Amino acid sequence: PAYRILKPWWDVFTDYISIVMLMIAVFGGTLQVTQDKMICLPCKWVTKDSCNDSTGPTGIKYDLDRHQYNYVDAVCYENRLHWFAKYFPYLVLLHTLIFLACSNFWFKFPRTSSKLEHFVSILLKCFDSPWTTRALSEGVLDKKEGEQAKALFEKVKKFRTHVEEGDIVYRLYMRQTIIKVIKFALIICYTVYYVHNIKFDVDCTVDIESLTGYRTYRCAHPLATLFKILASFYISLVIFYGLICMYTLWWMLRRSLKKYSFESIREESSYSDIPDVKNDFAFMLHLIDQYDPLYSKRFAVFLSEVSENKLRQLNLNNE
Amino acid sequence: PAYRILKPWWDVFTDYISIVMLMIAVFGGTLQVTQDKMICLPCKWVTKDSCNDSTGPTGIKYDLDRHQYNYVDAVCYENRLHWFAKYFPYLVLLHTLIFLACSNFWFKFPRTSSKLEHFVSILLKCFDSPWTTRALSEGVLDKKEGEQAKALFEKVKKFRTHVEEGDIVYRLYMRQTIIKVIKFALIICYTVYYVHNIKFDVDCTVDIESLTGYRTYRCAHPLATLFKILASFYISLVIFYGLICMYTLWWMLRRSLKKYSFESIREESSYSDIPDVKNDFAFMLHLIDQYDPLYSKRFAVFLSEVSENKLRQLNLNNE
Amino acid sequence: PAYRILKPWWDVFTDYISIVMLMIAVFGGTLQVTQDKMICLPCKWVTKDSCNDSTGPTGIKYDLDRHQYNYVDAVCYENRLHWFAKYFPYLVLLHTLIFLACSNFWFKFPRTSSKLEHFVSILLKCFDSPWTTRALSEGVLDKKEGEQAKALFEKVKKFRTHVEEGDIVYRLYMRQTIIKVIKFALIICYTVYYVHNIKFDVDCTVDIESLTGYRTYRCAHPLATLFKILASFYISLVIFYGLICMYTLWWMLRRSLKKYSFESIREESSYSDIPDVKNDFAFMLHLIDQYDPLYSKRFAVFLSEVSENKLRQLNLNNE
Amino acid sequence: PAYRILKPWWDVFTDYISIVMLMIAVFGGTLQVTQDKMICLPCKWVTKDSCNDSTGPTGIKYDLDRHQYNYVDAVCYENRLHWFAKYFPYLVLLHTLIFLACSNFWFKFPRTSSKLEHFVSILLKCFDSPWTTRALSEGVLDKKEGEQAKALFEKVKKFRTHVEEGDIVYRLYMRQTIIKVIKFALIICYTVYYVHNIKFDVDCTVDIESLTGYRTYRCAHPLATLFKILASFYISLVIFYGLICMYTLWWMLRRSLKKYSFESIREESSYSDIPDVKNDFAFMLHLIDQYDPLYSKRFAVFLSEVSENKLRQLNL
Amino acid sequence: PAYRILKPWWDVFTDYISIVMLMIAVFGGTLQVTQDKMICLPCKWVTKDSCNDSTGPTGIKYDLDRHQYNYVDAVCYENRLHWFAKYFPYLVLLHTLIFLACSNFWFKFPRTSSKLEHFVSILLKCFDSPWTTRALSEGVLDKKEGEQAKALFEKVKKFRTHVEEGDIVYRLYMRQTIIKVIKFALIICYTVYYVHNIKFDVDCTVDIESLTGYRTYRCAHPLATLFKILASFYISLVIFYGLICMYTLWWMLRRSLKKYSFESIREESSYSDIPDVKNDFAFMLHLIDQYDPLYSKRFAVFLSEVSENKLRQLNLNNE
Amino acid sequence: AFRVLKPWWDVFTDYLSVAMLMIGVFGCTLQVMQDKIICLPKRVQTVEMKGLKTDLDLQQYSFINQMCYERALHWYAKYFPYLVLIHTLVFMLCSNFWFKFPGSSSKIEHFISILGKCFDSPWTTRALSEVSKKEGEQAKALFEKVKKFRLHVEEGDILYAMYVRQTVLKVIKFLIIIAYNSALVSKVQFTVDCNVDIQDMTGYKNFSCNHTMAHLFSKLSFCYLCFVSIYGLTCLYTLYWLFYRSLREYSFEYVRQETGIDDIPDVKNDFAFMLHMIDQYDPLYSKRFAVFLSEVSENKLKQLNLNNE
Ligand SMILES: CCCCCCCC/C=C/CCCCCCCC(=O)OC[C@H](COP(=O)(O)OCCN)OC(=O)CCCCCCC/C=C/CCCCCCCC
Numbered sequence A, B, C, E: 001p002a003y004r005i006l007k008p009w010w011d012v013f014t015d016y017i018s019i020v021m022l023m024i025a026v027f028g029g030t031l032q033v034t035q036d037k038m039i040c041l042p043c044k045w046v047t048k049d050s051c052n053d054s055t056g057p058t059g060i061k062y063d064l065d066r067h068q069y070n071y072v073d074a075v076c077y078e079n080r081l082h083w084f085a086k087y088f089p090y091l092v093l094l095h096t097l098i099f100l101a102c103s104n105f106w107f108k109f110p111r112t113s114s115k116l117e118h119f120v121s122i123l124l125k126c127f128d129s130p131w132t133t134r135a136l137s138e139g140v141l142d143k144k145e146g147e148q149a150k151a152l153f154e155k156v157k158k159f160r161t162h163v164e165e166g167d168i169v170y171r172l173y174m175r176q177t178i179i180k181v182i183k184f185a186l187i188i189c190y191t192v193y194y195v196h197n198i199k200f201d202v203d204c205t206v207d208i209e210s211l212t213g214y215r216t217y218r219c220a221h222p223l224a225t226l227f228k229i230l231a232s233f234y235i236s237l238v239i240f241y242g243l244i245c246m247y248t249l250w251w252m253l254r255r256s257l258k259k260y261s262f263e264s265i266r267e268e269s270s271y272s273d274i275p276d277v278k279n280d281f282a283f284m285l286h287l288i289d290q291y292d293p294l295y296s297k298r299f300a301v302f303l304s305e306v307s308e309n310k311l312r313q314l315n316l317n318n319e
Numbered sequence D: 001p002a003y004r005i006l007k008p009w010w011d012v013f014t015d016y017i018s019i020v021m022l023m024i025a026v027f028g029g030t031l032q033v034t035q036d037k038m039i040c041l042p043c044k045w046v047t048k049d050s051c052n053d054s055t056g057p058t059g060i061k062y063d064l065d066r067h068q069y070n071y072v073d074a075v076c077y078e079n080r081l082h083w084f085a086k087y088f089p090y091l092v093l094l095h096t097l098i099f100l101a102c103s104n105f106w107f108k109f110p111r112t113s114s115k116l117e118h119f120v121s122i123l124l125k126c127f128d129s130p131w132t133t134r135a136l137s138e139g140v141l142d143k144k145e146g147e148q149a150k151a152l153f154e155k156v157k158k159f160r161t162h163v164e165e166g167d168i169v170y171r172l173y174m175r176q177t178i179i180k181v182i183k184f185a186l187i188i189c190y191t192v193y194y195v196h197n198i199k200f201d202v203d204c205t206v207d208i209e210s211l212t213g214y215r216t217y218r219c220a221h222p223l224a225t226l227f228k229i230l231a232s233f234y235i236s237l238v239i240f241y242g243l244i245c246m247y248t249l250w251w252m253l254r255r256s257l258k259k260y261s262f263e264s265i266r267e268e269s270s271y272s273d274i275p276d277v278k279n280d281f282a283f284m285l286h287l288i289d290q291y292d293p294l295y296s297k298r299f300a301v302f303l304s305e306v307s308e309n310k311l312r313q314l315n316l
Numbered sequence F: 001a002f003r004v005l006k007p008w009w010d011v012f013t014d015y016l017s018v019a020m021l022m023i024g025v026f027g028c029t030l031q032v033m034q035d036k037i038i039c040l041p042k043r044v045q046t047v048e049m050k051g052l053k054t055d056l057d058l059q060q061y062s063f064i065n066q067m068c069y070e071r072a073l074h075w076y077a078k079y080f081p082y083l084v085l086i087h088t089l090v091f092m093l094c095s096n097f098w099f100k101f102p103g104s105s106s107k108i109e110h111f112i113s114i115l116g117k118c119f120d121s122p123w124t125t126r127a128l129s130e131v132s133k134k135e136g137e138q139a140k141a142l143f144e145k146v147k148k149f150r151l152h153v154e155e156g157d158i159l160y161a162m163y164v165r166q167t168v169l170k171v172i173k174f175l176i177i178i179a180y181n182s183a184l185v186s187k188v189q190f191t192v193d194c195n196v197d198i199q200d201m202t203g204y205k206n207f208s209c210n211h212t213m214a215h216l217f218s219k220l221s222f223c224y225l226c227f228v229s230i231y232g233l234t235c236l237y238t239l240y241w242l243f244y245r246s247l248r249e250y251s252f253e254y255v256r257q258e259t260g261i262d263d264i265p266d267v268k269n270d271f272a273f274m275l276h277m278i279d280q281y282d283p284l285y286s287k288r289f290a291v292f293l294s295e296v297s298e299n300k301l302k303q304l305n306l307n308n309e
């Protein structure tokens, strides 16, 4: 719909980063489901559960069947591959889903969603109202435009009485931003600390000697360096998702967003009776200013009693 | 949408070239995921970690299991296949994603997107204005048409004083073109430099003699040649892309786009009072002239004060 | 959309042939990706690097591992399978992409696209106007309908002045047809010459005797006969495509498409003042004549100034 | 494009049968691409280039590598498996694509498409015209509806003069029907004569003795039997298609569709002066009658000149 | 589309059940195409074509290659596997296609489709008619509204005269229900009878001793138990489908739907002269009663001749 | 638009149902994999170690694999995703059962339609200003519509009983799912001991198998258990909100205190339940609707229109 004006540049950037991280999750999950395996070769000479590592060259004969090799691979994939290298794509998918839910929670939570829909609808209809152009131009008026302007003025008064008492939208946005930086810190810590465990060479000691004949095996995890790449790329994107989110926190704490002053508008335009608004009205007008400040300007004429008197007088001239 | 008027032939060409390069990236990535492998046979005769290459013929017996062969393939793919031959499609996908982000950044960044939507709306409504047809023809006036013409004149003035102050759109387009040309330079450089490393036959020396019995192997990379006929093709596309971007670069440095001259338009039409617009207004009018000059003509009648005087006289006539 | 009137029967036929051609390309590319391989068996008995081709029967033992067989297949696929059999579907894909780009170049190129959109818009709106029906019936004329007819007359005159000056659309269409027909010639020549190289049995002599033990191998290419018939089928399509292009080229050279004559239309109709349009106007009028003569016949009355005088007199009686 | 009025029950039935033949073709093509293989085992005991077929049983040792087996499979698949069992899905693809092309050629060809759209537009406008309701009810008439009815009348007369001269639409529909029925006959003949060659057990004799050691092999074609059912069931569909097409041919040879008789409608209605239309307009009125009688009955009132006189004197 | 009012609850339920059955068919078809096989092992001890079943344990040496095993698997899957366990998904697919054809035949068959479209169109238009609202409330009538009411009233009369002659829709619906229930019975009979033939352990005596060395083998069909439960689930759905069909059949035998008495509405409403429609009118009215009786209530005031007289009088007052 | 009657619990349960459907689809796709179990026989016949030669073909190994997959692997580990699919289909079907009933949907649409007519009517804020030409006629018409709604929906109680039924069904399904899944989650094990009697076919009787995706199915089962636990806690809160206070009656006494009108009565039954629903959505709607419910306010409107005309 028309919620694009309610999403500043930081929200758009975080949404696109979430899309790329979802692409990472899907790609890694497809690879982990389809082609993730280990190629384990037994160590012929062992030195206290450690490989001893010791006329032409001829191949070492292990006497294992193909299914014994498959059993060794499965056991050393389950028991000795690190949990990060196995469940990295699913952790990424979980983190992306939580990030998306946090970013789009207030669009689905009924109390905030109703207020946001009301605000966006009245602001779109106000910005598209011809009375805004007529008033900012400062008697010719179309009749239907006449009671349209009057009804929209009354609707603006209704909305101010209906939204301004509460701050649920602002508090919800604050909590979403706080969660989206706490989770970013936790993700960065546990992902940077455990990314080094995605290795290509894995030495496994699984004690399946009664079924295979060997205790220690040397295994190759083929989709590891790629998992070292994707994770690194993921650690890049999350870092961006952190920094942007941190800026949002700064944007919500550098000044009080529960108070909006129309001082510039009544400084420029003639209608100096335009009051200052509080709470969710103030925060949503700040969000609108993050998209296009002109959307605020054409709204301000609808908040003034002098404009109400002028509209009433001109309508009364008309009908 | 109606943004096609803001995308000249260079932007459309780059979009299609990026679509083709994205197809290349997806195809190469699918092949890399599914079938990229090495087929490594050990060298029986060796000379200091180098293959010596020295009645009926009989096959050479290596005494290697299938899983030893798989391990040798995995190790020589990880350690001895060049990183370009393994991550060419992913680099191409990343480069296309960054190219498409640069091409479509100003349509998504709220500060520029709001102004672009504003300009597109006002220009499209001026294009379809009946007053434009009557004025370019040079009486009878439907009242709705008259007030819509006057209100759109005032809207032209308001949009002008809103946009002419700043040049954010021009700066963003400048930065996008600069990033897209330096990225083309970097891509052509490192891609031409490393294209020789995509070879079919790779001599791998990985020191897994304690696990296989052989030290040197001669691997075959089946997907090398196709990657080459991908990579060169990708290179070709990049070259075209770069050349197109270079033209766009020169197009914004050949003449000062920030000072649009209405000299030809005001010379042809009766209205010789057209003021020269400044900054983003000038840049977007140049972008419109690239698509269709007639639009600019059909916009000029809304910027001249002589046509405004004619409309005011006509309005006083019918009113 | 409504560009379909600008696509005659030859363009639609070539579009359908290109679609089925793209299906060929996708099908062959999928088959070459997934199942294109060689099954190579060494020639045990050889005479001067040539297969000598010499108590129940018992199998021939080659003493080759599965991996030696895979290496032999990869090397004889790379070095001795003909490049046409390997890269036929990719060549088909490239050829169809260039064919589709040439077919739809003028729709995306802004200079021709703007002119074509303008022509289609005013021609459709000329069709929709009931003044055409009233005039070809030749007062009964609504005031608003008469004013829309006058605005349409002015728009038609303005568009004639705008578009008759240049012939970019005709030149672009001629160039596209010429490029398509010469590409058809090249494709037919090289595909017909190289279609004999797609064979099921391929004798390979790759000199991997140090790694395998044999020099000459006899390989079976399973996706050869199909890759033959598809190619033949593809060839047939190209021939059809080429023939269509030939006729189109002849259609642009039999008579001067830049000198349109309204001789039959203005002879059958009462108005004998309809002038002969030229250049692009003539070109788009001929392309419309290919679709339906009714469209041109209804445009002739808005191209006539005597019909304009009759409309002026009728509207004069109306006011 | 609202062309559903031009498709009688035979056309809709053939379209659905062609869609199900498309599904046959895609399914069989996917199977023939992915899992159409052959499993060939050498015949140990050879008797003049043929298989002799002669406490605890022990498995037969052929001394063949897995790659020799794959080579034998490929060679006996290409050389000895009958081409019908290999290219039935591609043939059904081609046949049903030609069927779709024959069905939609008159919709895509500009010469017939323009006339089809022109007739459909004025038929739909006359079907919703208020004057038609008034006259079939048969003076109250608003000026605007009278003007639009007179305009639609003049459009009807001019389009009658424009279309009644030619008969290209009927000719194209005829040609499509004959091509469809003869292709039905050809498909049935060759498919029924060749459906018996899809066998599970195939004896292959390819003479690769220098590369394998054996000359005659016995091969199993795993996807044969399924194809057989597909082929047989595909055949059934074509039969229905042909029968349906047969009826269409019979319909277009039952009476001359280039002459449409309004005799019943102009007899039952008050206007007994309705003229008999000819050629293409007659054929498309016949198709519309095959869709719904009410459309033709309603359009009958826009052709009589007594209704024109009544409209003129009501407007006067 | 707009046929939702025509389909009762049982049609929607059968459509959902058909969708789930088609999901069964697709899932079983993919499993049969991809993973359906037999894994046959020869019985070493054979006594009269029967598996006789007679220090450290060691494996049985069958001395069979992988390809002889594949040949045995293919032969036993072809011969000694029951046709139900092989073609269950295809039979399900055919049954669902026939059920969907029967359920949606009257919407595609032109003779019934024209009548249904006519009835639905005029019923929806009468529902949306403002004269309906006036009649239920029983004035200010815009002349467009008044002419709409009179013309659509005449349309209702003409539609009644056009559709009261035939009863094709009722007959077609009856035939569809009867076919859908008799095919239900046949499906249950043949599916329940042969559901026990989907076994996991299957003995095959295929007589390929000259090619394998053994006559009897003991195969394990892996996709049997799953298929079994799928069949059970399919049977469950079929039973539900059948039950629904029986109710529909009962719904069309409880009362003659070709005689729809308007008794309740004509007692409730003031217009007590609403005539009792017959044949297809009555049947479609009964269907719309099953969907929503408010449709029939709002359509009833447009059939009564007292409503004719009152609408005529009030229209006379408005003229 | 029925979204105005979807509280936070309903939306949360719908999203949890979508997530559980995703889990079930992913589990089925994992079940599609051919390589499922890997079995090796038991007691098969610096130190240099040598491999144990089991003396078995590949077909013998595959036969052992399918035999132990069918007869030794627990049915939960093989059919858990299908059970998740069935359970989430039941949850999705029984979560919209209050909405998609024939008689209930018309009442819901009527209530939300006239409530939106209120929320957009000038006579509501006009009536608050009264408490604190054309619009008067529309006010009178909407007031007749409000009385029609009172006589049209207030009689029945189908909506509340139906919502209670669907909530109880959700709760009992959640309880059954949690109980049996928590009981059988211990059967998803990596190492399995298979003891099929195929000594006559292979030579061995005891096998040790590994279920390759047993770890993945265990994680999926725990995630599904967490999702079902959240779903059940949400449904238990829905039950608590349904039964902790009588939703069959709604008191307008808060408006009686706020609005000076005391003729405003206390409606009941479906009227009460849907007022509670829209109070969960937005509490302003009921407060603004109350000034249209009272009939002394209607007399005041009639007097105002009488003086105006
Ligand atoms: C986090 C939740 C995500 C959920 C998504 C689930 C996806 C489910 C996919 C179902 C897979 C079913 C097919 C299983 C085939 C198993 C084959 C196998 O084991 O692999 C063998 C072999 C791979 O091994 P090698 O050739 O050595 O290659 C690896 C080293 N280069 O593969 C095969 O033989 C065939 C594999 C079938 C692949 C099918 C899936 C491929 C999907 C493509 C990935 C994404 C598209 C391309 C991305 C490009 C970048 C945009």
Ligand SMILES: CCCCCCCC/C=C/CCCCCCCC(=O)OC[C@H](COP(=O)(O)OCCN)OC(=O)CCCCCCC/C=C/CCCCCCCC
Binding pocket: B027, B030, B034, B035, C025, C026, C027, C028, C029, C030, C033, C034, C035, C089, C090, C093, C222, D025, D026, D028, D029, D030, D033, D034, D035, D036, D037, D089, D090, D093
């Ligand atoms: C022009 C280029 C642009 C288009 C290119 C698209 C790229 C598509 C990428 C596909 C990746 C997925 C591949 C997964 C498998 C890879 C390796 C593998 O396991 O396959 C080998 C093996 C080969 O064995 P057989 O075919 O028995 O060989 C004997 C020949 N009788 O293949 C398989 O069994 C697995 C097949 C999996 C892929 C299936 C895809 C095939 C799709 C068919 C397309 C046509 C469908 C409709 C056609 C209608 C009739 C024409």
